[PDB]
Symmetry: D3
Subunit: 226 residues, 6 copies
């Protein structure tokens, strides 16, 4: 019924966002299928660019994060604007505001909320508040591979893993990976575990097939909370 | 310089808060010494009571945290109302709102911000946002437990009296911004200055 | 038909509930608005504050926030049926009520009780009936606590209430729930009936409204 | 220290509001004498006109009060705009927002807050919240006069009286009286055609 | 279909109650016919009154415009209060707030937004933001005439004209024309007394002047 | 007294860090000399990038301008965060909010307000709302020339000018606000620019 979609910041760094016209139909799709969708956008290059500039002039860490949040919010406005008619036209700046906005029965798009965390924590918090039992993380890769792609030749996709692995990475005993990196946040892990939120890592080029994803008729990796 | 005072929720579980009268005077002088002060209040028994009532009927975790957050905001208002004239009359509900409130040059009293963390995390976020190098945690004990005069966040990461800053986000923030955490008894708010100097009893957690 | 439900503060002082009736009322074509009292949490914070010399306006504000804590509790237990926002003024309530969902609210302004808030909200939502849920079955001929073998009063008027304010009549648990000038002024000018009943009977709100269950109704005159 | 000034709505029904120019001077002078000022404006004929119109089309009582309130706020914006630099540029819509605005140490101008009361109640609520011990009411009259003088046609102003005397010789609605009484706020009644320095008026003591 | 209705400030001065009744009456009409309506109210005499009152004591221009804007909001609440249950009970104070309010799927009523423009521009901004292809301007006259009919004889209503044509010879200001032109919004000028016949107006079955964007 | 500083979008593109540094330093200089400063930031390349991106998927014109506005606010937050303690920590999203934020007696940093206009209009509205008699426009050019130096003026007037959009011209004219055009690189000498002792073109209201 309720689902949260986390769009990696990378999505906003490519030549275009035509994928949004797709997501737009994907959302209409999911919609007609009796599925409500919440969306969280990352900061991408715009955030890294402003954070770096602010760091070179002495800005404190708290404020660097705020600039990353405002960048992620600019991406949320872009998405919200492409979803006219389907979305509640307001970007909540905190989880409490999200709860109010979600209260309107339409799609809600959000950026970051608070310093000291990434948008993955946001997507987790929002999935919990909206009683979403499934969080879909859309990044620029098909899913989680048994071994780091770019490093090791021809690797296969892991059909599923547990949250315990995401933290085995945060330690340093398991190499990060594009697709696992999008979820390396303790609060995110704590939230998906305490609320037992299933996480699906997939490629944002497959949004047109997100329903197949939710069914299993399509490539991706499932992170099961434990 | 700026300092943040985190008041344990236990402080509000007593049949008396006359202690706030001393805090009042503390801040005046503290200000006269050039100190700015931010205050963060805990939830205490009111928070625990509502979380339990809500939990018994099946309320979700997110909303349980929100109830604890509101309970702590009630304590924030009590403290703010007792500081009238010394404080900006508004309880911010997020770190961003805190930054705007702190901009008025007055004392700012806050409760919790977001589910999945404690007010200790709030205190650390605010200390960081206000450029405070010291976060004081006033509790119903003299320090961490004989009393340990000094310890590190690394000891905390090994996760009584220590229960306060036992929150991952709080730890991450104090470590990245290197904020010293002074744990002391709120009954001794009259000597925070001596405490801050290191001449009175307390436990100080060093950021590592 | 719109109706307002004022939940007495005592409701929150026990150890545990209204989600039930709201679904029913809803299905009978009723929109519901809810107001929560402050209860023991309010009295505790007001006493604490008073002891250290906090001014009256602020003591009321503490009472209001305590009432809001109870509002959030109720709202959180009503997820999906309720608009997720607690209005802090009658004006905010008007906007909130506009979404077509259940609205839960606490106090608005110093110098009044949530009974006043319940009256204002009933007027603004065009509710012709305000139900006051308390820990007693209604109003009684004589005070039940002080007098024995007393019968419940099925009907009385707003003039009876102000007689009590004038010190001409005696208070009661049920009556206490509505003793304040503003609430009285509002229900009188907008002719809103006020049903005083036991919250243990919230599941019987339909028959209460029809007049087929025990309660005391205060007529606007 | 703190003072609340309540301006009758009729003040805004005149041909001009030039006295707002002097009011600004009086505020600066009071300020320079260690006095902080808060202002509350009434609705006047603008409020009466919109209410009458709305009432004719069936608008409910709560909303009729809301139109009176927005009218009082328009007058509040006019006064606030004339006081630029001396005032916090925001018109609070509730006692709670007033507390927040009053927090800036500048003059605060406000209209009504909630249906069911007059701006007299508002001015009282605000005087209580601002620790003001004196509420000045600029009305259409010079003060309180005796309705039944022993001699026929003899009109004598009452320079002094109590909140009870008032409660008997009856602008100051219930909430207002309760608020001034519980917080022992002194009320100075004068006409909206004169100057604030301390002169003819009617002072009401809370008892 | 989304449509915006701009109500002249004069509407609130004379023939008061009947004007409000026909407007409510017509809003319910538009709703019955499958239209989503947005409403923008002018400041009228209340606005000119406060602006004059303020200009006489030296209030700056930005603030005079602000008083005019508050005057229009008072008219907005009046209309909004007469449309209870049909409208989102909130008056937005900026285009961004309007977009949010419009999201509730109900009728939205607004006054001005920012100093230096008229409600005409607001009505244009709102028509554009709500994806309205038609902006109705309900004034006290029947339509657009070559010359003011109150001075010149033998002058007839112009059924059709362009923004260029309008630009040469209250109705639409500089930003309004710019907005309706970049978003190709059709503007219908008509008499608010004929609001009770708005459906027949849209079907070109009744008297009005239609301005096409160019 | 009161002055508004309009900062061109280009400022946030090339020679980034040094521009931000000189700015916060000039703001601190202005504050030491009894000047109340208001800052208006343009959207720059961030703005153009998003508007282009949105336009390509068919986002309407009103929303394109809003993206341009949010981008200018991003630049505003950046400047604001570099001026902590000197600035009121809030970016107003409308003229009315600006008036409220200006009441705080601190430096205010703002981006755009409403669609259909440029930040030049915002700078003008803000100068008017804040009783600012002078509006400084900081761009990557020393000022105004008799002929632009790419195909071939110390003082001039508004009608002499007929850079500035319609609303801007209208507001500056009706409130008689002097506009000083200069090179943001020379922000290190704003005090002199204000006295008239440095390269700059001053536009006079008529
Ligand atoms: O709740 C949030 C969301 C985002 N960010 C900032 O935005 C960056 C961009 O977010 P993301 O794209 O990495 O998730 C984060 O790394 C961080 O600095 C935060 O501080 N808190
Ligand atoms: O930023 C916050 C502050 C408080 N709380 C809730 O309030 C309780 C009371 O806070 P504290 O007194 O334990 O700090 C926490 O345990 C928790 O459920 C949160 O979720 N987030
Ligand atoms: O609009 C309101 C609602 C509540 N209260 C404060 O909250 C207490 C709790 O309200 P109730 O439960 O008695 O209605 C009141 O007695 C009083 O001090 C107010 O001042 N104003
Ligand atoms: O807190 C308030 C202030 C004003 N008004 C409405 O505004 C009118 C104008 O206010 P005043 O000039 O009578 O004080 C009142 O008579 C009344 O209908 C209220 O309902 N509540
Ligand atoms: O977005 C707006 C709307 C209204 N007004 C002020 O309100 C007056 C009344 O509006 P209207 O009836 O001319 O449209 C305008 O002339 C003007 O001073 C503005 O400044 N900006
Ligand atoms: O009040 C404003 C401010 C900015 N913008 C948008 O932001 C862009 C960047 O602003 P600027 O740098 O051109 O001023 C503008 O071209 C435009 O699309 C607006 O629509 N309205
Ligand atoms: Mg009146």
């Amino acid at each position: 019924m309720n689902i949260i979609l986390k769009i990696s910041g990378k999505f906003f760094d490519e030549d275009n966002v035509d994928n949004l016209i797709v997501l737009r139909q994907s959302i209409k799709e999911l919609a007609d299928n009796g599925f409500r969708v919440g969306i969280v956008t990352g900061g991408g290059s715009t955030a890294r660019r402003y954070i770096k500039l602010a760091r070179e002039i002495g800005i404190g860490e708290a404020y660097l994060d705020l600039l990353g949040i405002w960048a992620s919010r600019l991406n949320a406005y872009l998405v919200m604007f492409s979803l006219q008619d389907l979305a509640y036209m307001h970007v909540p700046q905190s989880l409490e505001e999200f709860i109010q906005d979600w209260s309107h029965g339409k799609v809600v798009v959000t950026g970051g909320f608070q310093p000291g965390q990434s948008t993955a924590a946001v997507a987790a918090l929002v999935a919990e508040a909206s009683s979403s039992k499934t969080l879909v993380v859309a990044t620029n890769v098909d899913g989680v591979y048994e071994k780091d792609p770019r490093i090791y030749a021809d690797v296969k996709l892991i059909p599923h893993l547990t949250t315990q692995d995401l933290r085995k990475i945060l330690e340093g005993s398991q190499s990060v990976q594009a697709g696992t990196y999008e979820l390396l946040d303790p609060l995110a892990i704590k939230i998906v575990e305490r609320s037992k939120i299933r996480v699906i890592v997939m490629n944002y080029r497959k949004l047109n097939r997100i329903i197949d994803i939710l069914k299993g008729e399509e490539v991706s990796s499932i992170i099961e909370p434990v």
